Curated annotation (Swiss-Prot), chain A:
Compartments where found: Mitochondrion inner membrane; Cell membrane
Misc remark: The siderophore enterobactin (Ent) produced by enteric bacteria binds Fe(3+) and helps bacteria scavenge iron ions from the environment. As a consequence, the mammalian siderocalin LCN2 plays an important role in defense against bacterial infections by sequestering iron bound to microbial siderophores. LCN2 can also bind iron bound to endogenous or nutrient-derived iron chelators and plays an important role in cellular iron homeostasis.
Modified residues (Phosphoserine): S9, S21, S32, S62, S122, S140
Family per similarity comment: Belongs to the ATPase alpha/beta chains family.
Gene Ontology molecular function: any one: ATP binding
UniProt xrefs under SUPFAM superfamilies: C-terminal domain of alpha and beta subunits of F1 ATP synthase, N-terminal domain of alpha and beta subunits of F1 ATP synthase, P-loop containing nucleoside triphosphate hydrolases
Binding residues for ATP: Q171, G173, K174, T175, S176, Q429, Q431
Post-translational modification: Acetylated on lysine residues. BLOC1S1 is required for acetylation.
Glycosylation site residues: S32
Identification of the protein by name: ATP synthase F(1) complex subunit alpha, mitochondrial
GO biological process, alphabetically ordered: proton motive force-driven ATP synthesis
Swiss-Prot record, chain B:
Post-translational modification Phosphothreonine, affected residues: T254
Signal peptide interval: none
Any one of the GO CC terms: proton-transporting ATP synthase complex
Membrane topology type: Peripheral membrane protein
Location of the protein in the cell: Mitochondrion inner membrane
Keyword Glycoprotein in record: yes
Binding site for Mg(2+) 2: E180
Protein name per UniProt: ATP synthase F(1) complex catalytic subunit beta, mitochondrial
Annotated residues for binding of ATP: G151, G153, K154, T155, V156, R181
HAMAP family: ATP_synth_beta_bact
Subunit structure of this chain's protein: Homotrimer. Component of the ATP synthase complex composed at least of ATP5F1A/subunit alpha, ATP5F1B/subunit beta, ATP5MC1/subunit c (homooctomer), MT-ATP6/subunit a, MT-ATP8/subunit 8, ATP5ME/subunit e, ATP5MF/subunit f, ATP5MG/subunit g, ATP5MK/subunit k, ATP5MJ/subunit j, ATP5F1C/subunit gamma, ATP5F1D/subunit delta, ATP5F1E/subunit epsilon, ATP5PF/subunit F6, ATP5PB/subunit b, ATP5PD/subunit d, ATP5PO/subunit OSCP.
From Swiss-Prot, chain C:
Keywords: Acetylation, ATP synthesis, Hydrogen ion transport, Ion transport, Membrane, Mitochondrion, Mitochondrion inner membrane, Transit peptide, Transport, Ubl conjugation
PTMs per UniProt: Acetylation at Lys-139 decreases ATP production. Deacetylated by SIRT3. In response to mitochondrial stress, the precursor protein is ubiquitinated by the SIFI complex in the cytoplasm before mitochondrial import, leading to its degradation. Within the SIFI complex, UBR4 initiates ubiquitin chain that are further elongated or branched by KCMF1.
Organism ancestry: Eukaryota, Metazoa, Chordata, Craniata, Vertebrata
SUPFAM superfamilies xref list: N-terminal domain of the delta subunit of the F1F0-ATP synthase (SSF47928)
Gene name, Swiss-Prot/TrEMBL: ATP5PO
Protein name in UniProt: ATP synthase peripheral stalk subunit OSCP, mitochondrial
Organism: Bos taurus
Curated annotation (Swiss-Prot), chain D:
Organism per entry: Bos taurus (Bovine)
Residues of the full protein shown: 33 to 79 of 109
Protein name: ATPase inhibitor, mitochondrial
Function summary: Endogenous F(1)F(o)-ATPase inhibitor limiting ATP depletion when the mitochondrial membrane potential falls below a threshold and the F(1)F(o)-ATP synthase starts hydrolyzing ATP to pump protons out of the mitochondrial matrix. Required to avoid the consumption of cellular ATP when the F(1)F(o)-ATP synthase enzyme acts as an ATP hydrolase. Indirectly acts as a regulator of heme synthesis in erythroid tissues: regulates heme synthesis by modulating the mitochondrial pH and redox potential, allowing FECH to efficiently catalyze the incorporation of iron into protoporphyrin IX to produce heme.
Region spans: Disordered: 1-20
Annotated phenotype, changing E33A: Strongly impairs F(1)F(o)-ATP synthase-binding
Length: 508, 469, 188, 47
């Protein structure tokens, strides 16, 4: 056998009694350094996951405490670290700043501003590795988290305190779902209702810096940064930073949750945090498992995603919705990390490339999408229209094979095909054009009552637009009634009937 | 400082230092070699030993050979004097033309630009290729990828781009050939000399070449990309000017990294890849960027092992690119060249607010018709074409016309096809596809559209086909 | 780290690392001869059947082993270097390869005092005069001050002649190899 | 495990080649007919 601290330098020190002038309790000497992993001798009083600081100004996290040495993962390039360096304890587990002083600021995995807008306020700090809530603090998910997307709000409802999952392939629209969700919250944040405001956190793990810069420009254009934090852990960042960034975001959001406010955190992309952790584990010589991932990679994501809760009024009532994004490779939802996170979360928005190019953008594939919360996370009006819409779409999906033939089939199948095509053309949405819930319910109500069975499918996307502009301009009282009331009252139902008929009465 | 080789295993050399160690990434020079062998430090193993990867053959090394420590990473000559030359990873010239006489040497390892330097502006780069311009338009200052297996057209397409963009491009240009056939390196050298971008007489050369071809040991292939990237970075910053940067392939960088990882003591990852695949690729692809001080248009050819787009290397590379053009073998078998897959290619600027509503709508109509054609092909395998709804046959006819019309003859593929190269301005491509979709050509036969430039050439080819009928 | 002075001959392995540590420690403070003598002493001290039986049992705690070794070292009045080396080998549980460490340090010290082991192989024994001229010529091979350490084995497997090893240098004036050479070249 | 559009011609088995030929023969026939019509129109429009 052999140890890594049995090198002849340490033994030389210890033979001639030179090991008493060195403080091996709060300082250590690097034995090895390579591929971002340092092996340090000493630091006998160092805690697991504690942050140590190297002589050359770098930081590191001490992960592997073995009898001989400490395995530190360096937070940057190991160019500056040389064998024999001096590593000092910091004394505290890694923590990040939190507060409303972060809103509108781009930060890195450790809370340092990287947008060059000046120091970061940072009144309070919070440890990233904090246990999630328990059984008792939570209460069932009841409030809706308005995504602003017709498909997601109609057929895959997302509540507050829920862990959805935007799972899809490459270049299908996942980041677009996330950004539309972030941008749609301006109508609530601008207003005065203090229990509808949602604060957004966007964790960008492993994306190149140009992508994040364009994303920040997009948010600024939509004036949606004043309530957004962006935590960047881009590709050039060391593996430990990509590994921590989800936890920094989750703690910056747990701050809002603990104080009665509501937050939305979008871990984009989790399949890259898994890769960074895989790197760190393999370089620390930890035993690999399936696909070379460490054994505790389910633990890594579960202890992160189980912090998305809906606290009860005895704790504040705040909440932290989570929208982890995962990129499946071909369609393989049976791979390792997709499997883990599908078994961890509460639903999934499954995106397609067949649907993306068939013209159905957003490419949300209903039937594979699910929300185990469901109607509990919908408003009464949205429930009323979405029950029928979902039933009709389900009927349409089992006779969609005949869609090509269509004719030479009974009248019931013809009607199913026609209604399904109209509904699918209805769920189509632009980009960065979310819609208030009243708009969505008006449009879907028009669709699902047959008032479009006469229009040609190619004209439904133009109808939707013109009708929506009409109602938004002429009829604000009805929309306001539906919004504030939350339901479709009989008088409001009659008003919607007359409006839809009058606009459709002449459309051409 | 002076050290001493203590082990040689393959391309990995362990060097022991009695004085202070050299920092990681430093270049060390082996003493006693007829040529120049440069090792690069990769790890500190303790007991004063440092592991290193050799940038050249480690044959004839003797346990005990003295080694010098240069004190800095590999420093290459940079400046306007490198234009028209060729270089190794370590910067020495391999064009048999004399020393590169510069005043600036740049280290090949540097930190990536910070977030406060990113440009956020995008404007289409018109390349003159119908499929690229229509469905996956490029962008000035953006990073382009050319995925595809072996034998699909990566090299031909990249040569075509050099022919078009580089020839009529005011700024400079750089070509880093990473782990590719040396025959192709020589062919490019001579083609460039003929065209005139490389001028051996005057000082008017517009291209600097760096070559790390596939006869080199893994250490040199893993670093020639950084050498070319350093030349491009200097031209971006100090010259303060536009630059192009072509790389072929950027999969050999990853692969060369994988050929030494096991010997450096790292456990392998998913499929015989190094554990540091994503980090190693990111620390390189993050210096190929358009900062606010300059602008690099980067075109990268990316080998996809066995056409598998889900392999870890191409899969990871996908996230570092603005535009991608996934060349497909299933389309190259059909004779459609370039074999760019219209449904598997994407661009960031492909939005109605960047290109325009006409361009965007034409592109989306083409993609939708091709996807519908794919859906129909399953039915035609059972019914037959004779049994389709008289509307479906219209979709199939339009889809086949559009499939053929995306093919185009290059000026560099004259030898293969024998045809003549065509450059199609963007408006002409948009008009052609808008007309083909609108039905203004549903009488001309399919083959009229095969390997032609603008649509009028298809009309003329159909006229000729009819006359000699 | 402390710039240890390297030994002349590099011994490798666990014993190599421990012995190189000891040699570097002794070379500074200049206690190589005394420490070698103490190592030879502990070579027998630990070999005692009682001590060996009490140190090869891994169920006596390392604490008891270290205490017993401290008592023995005090009872033998050793240098602090050798006492610390024994303590270090005991803590790390490396007692089962202590004789390997002593052998390594012996090899390392022999080269320090300038010795090049030599081997001579012949079919039969030699007359002392011939061995004397062999001594002279082999000393001719060596450098200045490099004492020789001759070993004269007798191998009848070879058919005659002589075989000489001086360090890594090798000269084979043996009948067998020349028979082999002629048989092979002639066979071609 | 699912199925996607345009998979019969992605496998390239017997059905893939059969479908490719069933398409090519039909469109060669239609191209011949259209070329004949194009020649007729050419001749009829000279004057």
């Amino acid at each position: 056998k052999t140890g890594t601290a049995e090198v002849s330098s340490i033994l030389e020190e210890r033979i001639l009694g030179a090991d008493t002038s060195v403080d091996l309790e709060e300082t250590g000497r690097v034995l090895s350094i390579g591929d971002g992993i340092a092996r340090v001798h000493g630091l006998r009083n160092v805690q697991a996951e504690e942050m140590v600081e190297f002589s050359s100004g770098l930081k590191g996290m001490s992960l592997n405490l073995e009898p001989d040495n400490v395995g530190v993962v360096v937070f940057g390039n190991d160019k500056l670290i040389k064998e024999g360096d001096i590593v000092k304890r910091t004394g505290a587990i890694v923590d990040v700043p939190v507060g409303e002083e972060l809103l509108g600021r781009v930060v890195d995995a450790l809370g340092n501003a990287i947008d060059g807008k000046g120091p970061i306020g940072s009144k309070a700090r919070r440890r990233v590795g904090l246990k999630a809530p328990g059984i008792i603090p939570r209460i069932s998910v009841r409030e809706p988290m308005q995504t602003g997307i017709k498909a997601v709000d109609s057929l895959v409802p997302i509540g507050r305190g829920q862990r959805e999952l935007i799972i899809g392939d490459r270049q299908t629209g996942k980041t677009s779902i996330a950004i539309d969700t972030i941008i749609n919250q301006k109508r609530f944040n601008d207003g005065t209702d203090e229990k509808k405001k949602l604060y957004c956190i966007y964790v960008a793990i492993g994306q190149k810096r140009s992508t994040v810069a364009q994303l920040v420009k997009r948010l600024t254009d939509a004036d949606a940064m004043k309530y957004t934090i962006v935590v960047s852990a881009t590709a050039s960042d060391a593996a430990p930073l990509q590994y921590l960034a989800p936890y920094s975001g989750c703690s910056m959001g747990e701050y809002f949750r603990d104080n009665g406010k509501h937050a939305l955190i979008i871990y984009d992309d989790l399949s890259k945090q898994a890769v960074a952790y895989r790197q760190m584990s393999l370089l620390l010589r930890r035993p690999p498992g399936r696909e070379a991932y460490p054994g505790d990679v389910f633990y890594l994501h579960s202890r992160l995603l189980e912090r998305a809760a809906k606290m009860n009024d005895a704790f504040g009532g705040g909440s932290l919705t989570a929208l982890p994004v995962i990129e499946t490779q071909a369609g393989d939802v049976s791979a390792y990390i997709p499997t883990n996170v599908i078994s961890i979360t509460d639903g999934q928005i499954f995106l397609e490339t067949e649907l993306f190019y068939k013209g159905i953008r957003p490419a949300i594939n209903v039937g594979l999408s699910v929300s185990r919360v469901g109607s509990a996370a919908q408003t009464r009006a949205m429930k009323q229209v979405a029950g029928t819409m979902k039933l009709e779409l389900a009927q349409y999906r089992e006779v969609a094979a005949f869609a090509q033939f269509g004719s030479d089939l009974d009248a019931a199948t013809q009607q199913l095909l026609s209604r399904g095509v109209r509904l699918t053309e209805l769920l189509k949405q632009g980009q960065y054009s979310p819609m208030a819930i009243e708009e969505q319910v008006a449009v879907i109500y028009a669709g699902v009552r047959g008032y479009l069975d006469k229009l040609e499918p190619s004209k439904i996307t133009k109808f939707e637009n013109a009708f929506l502009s009409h109602v938004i301009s002429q009829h604000q009282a009805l929309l306001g009634k539906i919004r504030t009331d939350g339901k479709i009252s009989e008088e409001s139902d009659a008003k919607l009937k007359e409006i839809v008929t009058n606009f459709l009465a002449g459309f051409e | 400082t002076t050290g001493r080789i203590v082990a040689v295993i393959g391309a990995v050399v362990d060097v022991q230092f009695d004085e202070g160690l050299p920092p990681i990434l430093n270049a060390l020079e082996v003493q006693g070699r007829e040529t120049r062998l440069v090792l690069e430090v990769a790890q500190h193993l303790g007991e004063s030993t440092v592991r290193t990867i050799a940038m050249d053959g480690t044959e004839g090394l003797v346990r005990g050979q003295k080694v010098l420590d240069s004190g800095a990473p590999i420093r290459i000559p940079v400046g306007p004097e490198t234009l028209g030359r060729i270089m190794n990873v370590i910067g020495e010239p391999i064009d048999e033309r004399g020393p590169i006489k510069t005043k600036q040497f740049a280290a090949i390892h540097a930190e990536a630009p910070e977030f406060v330097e990113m440009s956020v502006e995008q404007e289409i780069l018109v390349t003159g290729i119908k499929v690229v311009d229509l469905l996956a338009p490029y962008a000035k200052g953006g990073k382009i990828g050319l995925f595809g297996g072996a034998g699909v057209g990566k090299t031909v397409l990249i040569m075509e781009l050099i022919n078009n963009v580089a020839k009529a491009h005011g700024g400079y240009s750089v070509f880093a050939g990473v782990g590719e056939r040396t025959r192709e390196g020589n062919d490019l050298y001579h083609e460039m000399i003929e065209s005139g971008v490389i001028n051996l007489k005057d000082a008017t050369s517009k291209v600097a070449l760096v070559y790390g071809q596939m006869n080199e040991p893994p250490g040199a292939r893993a670093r020639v990309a950084l050498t070319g990237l350093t030349v491009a970075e200097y031209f971006r910053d100090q010259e303060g000017q536009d630059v192009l940067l072509f790389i072929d392939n950027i999969f050999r960088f990853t692969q060369a990294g994988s050929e030494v990882s096991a010997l450096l003591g790292r456990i392998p990852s998913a499929v015989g890849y190094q554990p540091t695949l994503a980090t190693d690729m990111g620390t390189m692809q993050e210096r190929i960027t358009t900062t606010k001080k300059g602008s690099i248009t980067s075109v990268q050819a990316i080998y996809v092992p066995a056409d598998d787009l889900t392999d870890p290397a191409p899969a990871t590379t996908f996230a570092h690119l603005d535009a991608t053009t996934v060349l497909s073998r299933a389309i190259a078998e059909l004779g459609i060249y370039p074999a760019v897959d219209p449904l598997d290619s994407t661009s960031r600027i492909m939005d109605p607010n960047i290109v325009g509503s006409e361009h965007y709508d034409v592109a989306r109509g083409v993609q939708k018709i091709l996807q519908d054609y794919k859906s129909l092909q399953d039915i035609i395998a059972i019914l037959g074409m004779d049994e389709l709804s008289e509307e479906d046959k219209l979709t199939v006819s339009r889809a086949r016309k559009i499939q053929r019309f995306l093919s185009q003859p290059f000026q560099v593929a004259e030898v293969f096809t024998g045809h003549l190269g065509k450059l199609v301005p963007l408006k002409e491509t948009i008009k052609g596809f808008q007309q083909i979709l609108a039905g203004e050509y549903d009488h001309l036969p399919e083959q009229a559209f095969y390997m032609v430039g603008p649509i009028e050439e298809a009309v003329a080819k159909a006229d000729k086909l009819a006359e000699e009928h | 780290f402390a710039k240890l002075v390297r030994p002349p001959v590099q011994i490798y392995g666990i014993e190599g690392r421990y012995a190189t540590a000891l040699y570097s420690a002794a070379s500074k403070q200049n206690k190589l001869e005394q420490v070698e003598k103490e190592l030879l002493r502990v070579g027998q001290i630990l070999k005692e059947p009682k001590m060996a039986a009490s140190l090869l049992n891994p169920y006596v705690k390392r604490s008891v082993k270290v205490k017993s070794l401290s008592d023995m070292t005090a009872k033998e009045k050793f240098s602090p270097l050798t006492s610390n080396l024994i303590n270090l080998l005991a803590e790390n549980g490396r007692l089962t390869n202590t004789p390997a460490v002593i052998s390594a340090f012996s090899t390392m010290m022999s080269v320090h005092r300038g010795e090049v082991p030599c081997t001579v192989t012949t079919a039969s024994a030699l007359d002392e005069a011939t061995l004397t001229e062999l001594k002279t010529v082999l000393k001719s091979f060596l450098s200045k001050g490099q004492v020789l350490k001759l070993e004269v084995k007798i191998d009848p497997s070879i058919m005659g002649g002589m075989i000489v090893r001086i360090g890594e240098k090798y000269v084979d004036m043996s009948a067998k190899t020349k028979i082999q050479k002629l048989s092979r070249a002639m066979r071609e | 495990v699912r199925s996607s559009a345009g998979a019969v011609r992605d496998a390239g088995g017997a059905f893939g080649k059969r479908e490719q030929a069933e398409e090519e023969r039909y469109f060669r026939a239609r191209a011949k007919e259209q070329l004949a019509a194009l020649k007729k129109h050419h001749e009829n429009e000279i004057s």
